[PDB]
Design a protein around this ligand. Structure first.
Ligand SMILES: CC(=O)N[C@@H]1[C@@H](O)[C@H](O[C@@H]2O[C@H](CO)[C@@H](O[C@@H]3O[C@H](CO)[C@@H](O)[C@H](O)[C@H]3NC(C)=O)[C@H](O)[C@H]2NC(C)=O)[C@@H](CO)O[C@H]1O
Ligand SMILES: CC(=O)N[C@@H]1[C@@H](O)[C@H](O[C@@H]2O[C@H](CO)[C@@H](O[C@@H]3O[C@H](CO)[C@@H](O)[C@H](O)[C@H]3NC(C)=O)[C@H](O)[C@H]2NC(C)=O)[C@@H](CO)O[C@H]1O
Ligand SMILES: O=c1ccn([C@@H]2O[C@H](COP(=O)(O)OP(=O)(O)O)[C@@H](O)[C@H]2O)c(=O)[nH]1
Ligand SMILES: O=c1ccn([C@@H]2O[C@H](COP(=O)(O)OP(=O)(O)O)[C@@H](O)[C@H]2O)c(=O)[nH]1
Ligand SMILES: [Mn+2]
Ligand SMILES: [Mn+2]
Lengths: 801, 801
């Protein structure tokens, strides 16, 4: 017996009782239903409201249909798809803009055809697996086109039409099996060189500069004459080079792309928002790819056409995911010969690609090459210290380390900007090892592999060399000069060095651990194996010395400066005078200041982000710079007051003058003279701050029934709770590992420093440090000299062998 | 002219071109539409599929309708509500269970009535603001009822029916204006005492124990005889007390409530999942409240009925939000006299509520009272050290600090478990200051107020005392013994102490800062103001001494033990012998071990969660315990070998024996004898570990068109980005503040310790420390004696004044 609940939701508050077990009489319920008439009025209103549909409602219905289809439910998907198709077909007539009307009509027809196909599939007439809407790319004219632009030759269809398609491929390896194709493959052009330009949250200026530089490089490649020994022959000839180069611009997400970048892309005819919004309504795209052959004009000069594929991912993911998409999908489809990788903003020079291709074609044994990296505008604004210090560091590191590692044909790390590979030695196992993280959950991999974040470049570099049944060796080219941009403040430098140091240390540990695979599996010449053994010994020694760097720096400064001041060993002044208070006060002040600075640095670095702590980092850097400048002045005075000796001059040469010798040999001597003073004032800051902060933030890393409803809710809740627990456990493990590593490092350094201070004197420790430093710098100088000899000789002596 | 796109979504890959500006001819489009016939087949399938609706689909449609209604869109809300109502009305007939059928029929009728009301409102016939579905509470019989249970008297309707209603109130202050009511108010009973039992992720055993203890307390209150001077008179008499007590059980979220707790609640008839799922389909409830008068039986004895309101919040929020809901909604509606707050698991004793009510009624000036807190089963399992140490700390803290602060009538912090207030001094401004965080975004409040997390109890305690135009003083009752449960391991203790120490320190700073309001605004007696001044001076001195505790502990241990060993000042052994190596080796070992331990502790505490670092914390605690035990043994030997003096014995008494004197005065002497040895072995661990880890993790804290669509998307993205930036900025500010505070604390301690070590000797520093400690302990002992005198005298001397 139903109570008086005729007005229960209408009134503000209503109380009722619902007995259980009576089940009610149906006649009373029907009488209650028939006694209410107002409902019809509401019904009429709804029937009046639903007559005219709306674009937004149709898009929402299509989105719901796509979500349901991705959820393994088809009947609701079919109903929603039919409703959306009919709604869009009705709506298309009302719109006034011809573009919008045409796009809506095409989308409606496509949706109706997909509905028919799915209905046929449900009946079992068509046998497929995981049915999806058919691929339907759309070509539209460009809004803005330059009437006055003279190029080699451009078909009207290629020149004035930009193509678009959304993709659904969840595993990019299947990008070609699902039936997707590009304009280049369809047209018959077969590019040989592919360049990937990753982009995420970047202003239009950097992209414009990169595209202009690429066009200039292509023009220079075109303009070279034939018949010369240094001229490339083959598909890279003149007047036809622009058809053999393809540029993939892989963005990282609509949510983070700078709006001005989107405006610039729309200006050059590569991104139209209306087409993206309309065509991708119900597909549920992982990415959207636009294709064009863009033409760029700067000032009064016209550049060469560039074939461009712009891929925009719906979600956000790391750069490794962008490389995954690029390499797997596009490389597997087009199958090029040389694959080049660079970041946005890397402004090349005229003669970079020519040198790279020349080296690749002539040598035939190079499994990967990298160019020299330099800072844009080093001389300009010489007042700033950080830019000059970074310029000096880039020059010295490039010359010495790259030369030495290229002599043995094993580059430790190719720069993430402007690197190149040949797509024959990285197709199989090396790429699989490159993308090991993206295919396996980090719980299975463990902490060691997981912590190798922003370091996979070294993984690929090692895998190319140690590939089984092959002998691929990396190489370094001097002339491939690429100009980047560096942070102008301390905080950005700190963050960048954090990433670089973490990746470098863990990749180096992995390489040292797995070096044996070269002898076990690879097929190299015996001389190559011996050279690799020598380089392995050198690498072990250098890593061991670099792991104990802060203690060595502290000991050197302390001993030399202060125990020459206190124990009267400075040669330009006698300190046997004074009241014995200053002599100990200097040492106490130095020790207390150093310890307090280190404590403050470690607390701040482990604690919070280094962006709001600008003043403290500036203060610590200034203190350390003053200390290092004072120590350098005292050392210079000591050296210039000593009557000099053969041992002394040999040590001084092999310790300090190796930089000047190498720079004069390679002709880059003026930069060193300009920037050595600036670099000398940041060495302790570099070592301490960067290493400590890198090791501190290592944690940072990526038609049922009621019973069915209840069971579904319980299962979903249980699964969510289990997933949350697993994520928490993984984070706990990574934090524990990073804490253990940091404790080991800090305590090893402290114990070593204390033992050396308490159980050794200056006359018994400094010779060992001098010998170690002299040995390392002598090895590096020999490597640089060997590389220069090779680069200036092998061209002429290639005729002999 | 439309291209051949008849088969575009059907095929795997289709290429087409869509010109812009032509707008297409409608005749060709219509001819293309009329040339396709297969669509009808699909249509038929949909018409066949949509005939039979489903419960889950109806619930999903209602949920979408509620979401749309909350989104200020009414037409779509009206359509979805009508569709869901019709679907549920059709579905209700098919179900077999009478309960499900009745609930579905009632929900369908309610939905249809709400649809009619909303349709009338849209036409403007009814004038309202923010229309919402009408409140409709449902009473259902309990599944399990005890046939054999003899109580005082129970109406059939009250005994055998449980009531339920979902609420929508976004601002709980409006809980009574929206028209919601409780069973107690409707029935005519007017409770006077309200008890809130917060719950979040707790096992059934704790809740069962708490309910059993509450029933025992009510029975003891009932059984007391009248006509006695110590017997309460009024609404708390016998045979009718159970009607004047209401218990609010406020959960914290369905996602985190332990399933066994839900099963237990369903067992005693307070939670039915089917009713919750069905009735709350379209309201969009912030909380769901069930009401019952539950009867509990344990073993062969039957307890007294308890009026219970169980409120379950849909989302998760802090305990402060639960108190907000409880206080505002229920206190404003019922308007009780005394409000009691306790946590789940607080097992009371028989004579707790009686003592609390007796004190409140007799004194008439107490604006809030708190009971003594103790550990359950202290003697059992005496092998464990942590439980005994916590028991000793609870006893000593309670006795001394509570007695001294109750003498001046200002308790620093009432325990979060088993506290009480009178609902006349907290109704206005004090509650507004209590809930300042929940009504104002933390950006406006700033870092200082925001960092006062888990400390609002002290805020309320201070606001009650310093209320304008009133004189309310807090009070402490000795006999209100409540037994809690304490963590058995070091890690849980560490986390709990982290929370407590953070809250305590920042609340203490706030109180010291704003103490002037008592003199400025409050209306107290002059003698009260003088007493508050004396207590303020004592509080300042104690806080100042406690801020420099680690340095004082280190100095005391170092000086006494090691500089008695090295400089031959231990009185039971002469160290003028030995080869001068041990004498300095002891000091060096002590200093190095202490510094390394502190460094490890601070790095670990700042670094990661203290749950996977169990071994390191155990090791550090063991080292510090061994050190403290050795120091205690050496000190005892020194004291017992000295020929003794009046000054020495006075210092020893006023330093150590104050604990024993106070415990013997209050009769709790056996616990101190049992647990003093265990507590002595954790003092350095307590101080260092708890303070450092508390200060390390301070960061932890809580029908449009296409152009309209594009503008909507852009606006939503911009708003989301702005919100993300604001959240990041707030987190940056809080991290910076906590880092600055930690640096200040650590560097102050280190500088003080170094200065005292280098510029002072044992004979020039220890007397000051002895004087300070003796003064503080003498003041505390005098406070305890005064409190005991008051508690044993005022009862007899109340006749005089
Ligand atoms: C730590 C050590 O032993 N030696 C230092 C070198 O590690 C360091 O070389 C730099 O290595 C990193 C590793 O990748 C390179 O980072 C890449 O940089 C490019 C261009 O700047 C960027 O596009 C990439 O994203 C980035 N890779 C990432 C983030 O994974 C960096 O280019 C190397 N620098 C050079 C000149 O090659 C050098 C650099 O100062 O210092 C040694 O001390
Ligand atoms: C740090 C200092 O100067 N003195 C210490 C006191 O702060 C501490 O007293 C404790 O204060 C906290 C503050 O609230 C109380 O925490 C509450 O505890 C109850 C029951 O355990 C719990 O229900 C509450 O949730 C919790 N409040 C929160 C989390 O905000 C604690 O009860 C107080 N302890 C006592 C016995 O009253 C004492 C305790 O050892 O130590 C002083 O050194
Ligand atoms: O989430 C991200 C962040 C960055 N990047 C790219 O990775 C590189 C980051 O380089 P970094 O900022 O270290 O140095 P930069 O060369 O940009 O100054 C750039 O090419 C970015 O576009 C990316 O693909 N995804
Ligand atoms: O998100 C939360 C976490 C805890 N609590 C309650 O707050 C108190 C936390 O007490 P704590 O864990 O510090 O000590 P306990 O007394 O529980 O051992 C308990 O009453 C919990 O039920 C809560 O309401 N919400
Ligand atoms: Mn860059
Ligand atoms: Mn508890």
């Amino acid at each position: 017996p139903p109570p008086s609940i005729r007005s229960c939701g209408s009134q503000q508050y209503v109380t009722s009782y619902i007995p259980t077990g009576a089940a009610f009489p149906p006649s009373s319920v029907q009488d209650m239903i028939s006694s209410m008439k107002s409902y019809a009025s509401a019904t009429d209103l709804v029937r009046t409201y639903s007559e005219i549909p709306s674009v937004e409602e149709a898009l929402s219905t299509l989105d719901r249909a796509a979500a349901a289809l991705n959820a393994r439910r088809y009947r609701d998907a079919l109903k929603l798809y039919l409703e959306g198709g009919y709604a869009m077909a009705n709506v298309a007539e009302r719109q006034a803009n011809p573009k919008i009307c045409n796009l809506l009509t095409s989308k409606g027809f496509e949706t109706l055809n997909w509905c028919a196909r799915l209905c046929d599939w449900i009946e079992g007439r068509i046998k497929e697996k995981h049915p999806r809407p058919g691929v339907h790319k759309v070509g539209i004219p460009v809004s803005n086109w330059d009437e006055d632009w003279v190029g080699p030759f451009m078909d009207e269809e290629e020149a004035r039409r930009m193509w678009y398609t959304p993709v659904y491929c969840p595993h990019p390896i299947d990008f070609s099996n699902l039936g997707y194709r590009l304009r280049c493959v369809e047209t018959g052009r077969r590019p040989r060189l592919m360049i990937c330009i990753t982009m995420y949250n970047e202003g239009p200026q950097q992209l414009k500069a990169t595209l202009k530089k690429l066009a200039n490089n292509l023009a220079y490649l075109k303009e070279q004459m034939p018949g010369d020994e240094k001229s490339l022959t083959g598909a890279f000839a003149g007047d036809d080079v622009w058809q053999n180069v393809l540029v993939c611009i892989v963005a990282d997400g609509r949510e983070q792309v700078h709006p001005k970048t989107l405006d610039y892309l729309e200006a050059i005819g590569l991104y139209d928002e209306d087409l993206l919004t309309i065509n991708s309504a119900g597909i549920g795209a992982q990415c959207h790819l636009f294709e064009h052959t863009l033409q760029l004009s700067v000032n009064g000069k016209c550049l060469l056409p560039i074939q461009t594929v712009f891929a925009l991912k719906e979600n956000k993911a790391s750069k490794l995911d962008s490389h995954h998409w690029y390499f797997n999908a596009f490389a597997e489809q087009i199958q090029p010969e040389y694959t080049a990788v660079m970041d946005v903003g890397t402004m090349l020079t005229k003669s970079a690609l020519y040198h790279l291709l020349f080296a690749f074609e002539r040598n035939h044994q190079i499994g990967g090459a990298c160019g020299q990296l330099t800072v844009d505008n080093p001389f300009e604004n010489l007042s700033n210290w950080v830019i000059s210090a970074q310029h000096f560091e880039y020059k010295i590191s490039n010359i010495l380390d790259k030369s030495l590692e290229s002599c043995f044909g094993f580059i430790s790390v190719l720069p993430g900007a402007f690197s190149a590979y040949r797509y024959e030695a990285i197709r199989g196992a090396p790429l699989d090892a490159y993308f090991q993280t993206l295919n396996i959950e980090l719980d299975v991999l463990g902490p060691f592999i997981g912590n190798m974040y922003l370091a996979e470049d070294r993984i690929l570099s090692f895998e190319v060399v140690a590939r089984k049944n092959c002998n691929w060796t990396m190489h370094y080219v001097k002339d491939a000069v690429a100009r980047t941009d560096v942070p102008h403040d301390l905080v950005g430098l700190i963050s960048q060095r954090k990433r670089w140091l973490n990746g470098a240390f863990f990749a180096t540990l992995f390489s040292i651990w797995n070096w044996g695979r070269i002898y076990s599996e690879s097929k190299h010449t015996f001389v190559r194996k011996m050279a690799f053994l020598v380089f392995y010994v050198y690498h072990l020694l250098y890593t061991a010395f670099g792991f104990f760097l802060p203690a060595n720096l502290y000991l050197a400064l302390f001993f030399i400066v202060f125990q020459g001041f206190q124990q009267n060993r400075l040669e330009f002044i006698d300190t046997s005078e004074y009241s014995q208070t200053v002599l100990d006060c200097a040492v106490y002040i130095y020790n207390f200041s150093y310890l307090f600075g280190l404590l403050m640095l470690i607390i701040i670095g482990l604690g919070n982000n280094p962006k709001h702590m600008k003043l403290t980092y500036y203060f610590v850097g200034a203190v350390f710079g003053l200390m290092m400048m004072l120590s350098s002045l005292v050392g210079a005075g000591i050296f210039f007051s000593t009557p000099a000796t053969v041992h002394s001059i040999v040590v001084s040469i092999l310790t300090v003058g190796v930089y000047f010798i190498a720079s004069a040999l390679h002709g880059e001597v003026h930069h060193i003279f300009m920037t050595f003073t600036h670099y000398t004032a940041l060495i302790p800051s570099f070592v301490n701050i960067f290493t400590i902060y890198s090791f501190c933030n290592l944690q940072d890393l990526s038609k049922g029934d009621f019973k069915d409803v209840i069971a579904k809710r319980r299962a979903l809740e249980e699964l969510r709770r289990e997933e949350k627990e697993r994520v928490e456990n993984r984070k706990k493990n990574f934090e524990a590992f990073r804490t253990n590593v940091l404790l080991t490092w800090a305590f090893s350094n402290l114990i070593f420093a204390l033992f050396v201070v308490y159980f050794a004197s200056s006359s018994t420790y400094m010779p060992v440090l001098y010998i170690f430093v002299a040995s390392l710098n002598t090895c590096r100088l020999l490597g640089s000299i060997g590389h220069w000899v090779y680069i200036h000789t092998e061209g002429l002596r290639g005729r002999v062998i």
